[PDB]
Structure 1
Amino acid sequence: PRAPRTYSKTYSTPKRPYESSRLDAELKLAGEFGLKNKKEIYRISFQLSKIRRAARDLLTRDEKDPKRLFEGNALIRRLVRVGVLSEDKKKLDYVLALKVEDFLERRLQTQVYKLGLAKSVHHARVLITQRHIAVGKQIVNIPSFMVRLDSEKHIDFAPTSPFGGARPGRVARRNAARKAEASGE
């Protein structure tokens, strides 16, 4: 006698188990963006899949139908916000177009590298998970963060860690200790 905590899942898996072309494609994606799971692609194809459905749905409605307008516009401005939808093609048949890379290109994982700051999607990961880098003063440690566009200007290393001042942190400090303890007194 409490309330259901509701949940749901965030991915869907391929109907065809072994399709060489699809495996190459997937891998290349995972390789460009530095993912670890075929699931990190599955998830995005799933997000996309829903988005596309909703899109089609509104699209069979009449032009200037209240629902299509309210929800369609909302869907769009929501997509423009993250930077998945180019401002030119801000009218839902390009959202019906779209495609997965347009989503991938916007993870924090990737933005951290794209404006230099990492020079490898992997160094990008390892950076992000290891706490350094943030959006405000707000440390983010999630490669899938999805950089919000008007916070693109705000991706820098954190007030903590090195890389944004504050310390070198035990390993370098361990070594500073080795210098002033071996060489001196």
Structure 2
Amino acid sequence: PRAPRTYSKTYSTPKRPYESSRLDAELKLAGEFGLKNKKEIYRISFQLSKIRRAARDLLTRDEKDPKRLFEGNALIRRLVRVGVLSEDKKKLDYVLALKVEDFLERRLQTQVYKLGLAKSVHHARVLITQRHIAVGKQIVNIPSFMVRLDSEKHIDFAPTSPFGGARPGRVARRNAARKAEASG
């Protein structure tokens, strides 16, 4: 037989199912960021837990330690590159103080809304999903895309779409067909 495919699970449900504070918190997050279920919030809190566990394992190590220097610089670099971690706060103690809204501001949905091509997070979601968006010269239809802060300058409409031009679309071409039918 062939080598097994590795897979892993990307979220984790919380321990107490029904607690009113956490429910109202996650509904505020879902409404402000335009999310469809609690699995997205669980995905981000899982990713943040993994980052915090690695940083917790490095801060127990003393300073000048080669593992701590190497992997702390790499983790800090990946966080400042994706834009979750600010340029001044680069000291592996700010890494611990991160929270899920820092990750949620960097999704392509909220970035399309903040750049102003959208007018809503929900409009941004459907604009992404229906393929009118291109982060480089390449279409992305995944709302959780986590743009890398030199890609923020290049989020724009897709060339092979309306709103980036050169052919209108199904319902517009139908309505034009009816009006040209009535003219002749």
How far residue 135 of structure 1 moved from its aligned partner, in angstroms, is: 1.2
How far residue 122 of structure 1 moved from its aligned partner, in angstroms, is: 0.2
Partner of 1:141 in structure 2?
141
How far residue 170 of structure 1 moved from its aligned partner, in angstroms, is: 1.3
C-alpha distance after superposition, 1:45-67 (max 9, x if no partner):
00000100000100000101000
Distance 2:110 2:147 in 1: 9
C-alpha distance after superposition, 1:76-112 (max 9, x if no partner):
0000001000011111100011110000000001100
For the aligned residue pairs, the C-alpha RMSD in angstroms reads 0.6
How far residue 182 of structure 1 moved from its aligned partner, in angstroms, is: 1.5
Distance 1:105 1:137 in 2: 22
How far residue 162 of structure 1 moved from its aligned partner, in angstroms, is: 0.7
Distance 1:114 1:64 in 2: 40
Q: Which runs of 5+ in 1 are unaligned?
A: none
Q: Secondary structure at the match of 1:126?
A: helix
Q: TM-score, normalised by structure 2?
A: 0.99
Distance 2:175 2:104 in 1: 39
Aligned pair count reads 184
Q: Secondary structure at the match of 2:81?
A: helix
How far residue 183 of structure 1 moved from its aligned partner, in angstroms, is: 2.3
Partner of 1:128 in structure 2?
128
Q: Secondary structure at the match of 1:97?
A: coil
Most deviating of 68-77 and 162-171: 162-171
Distance 2:136 2:143 in 1: 16
Distance 1:143 1:136 in 2: 15
How far residue 175 of structure 1 moved from its aligned partner, in angstroms, is: 0.6
Distance 1:172 1:150 in 2: 35
Q: Percentage identity across aligned positions?
A: 100
Q: Secondary structure at the match of 1:95?
A: coil
Distance 1:16 1:115 in 2: 38
Q: Secondary structure at the match of 1:89?
A: coil
C-alpha distance after superposition, 1:107-134 (max 9, x if no partner):
0011000011001000000000001110
Partner of 1:85 in structure 2?
85
List structure 1 segments (4+ residues) > 3 angstroms apart after TM superposition. Answer: none
Distance 2:60 2:95 in 1: 15
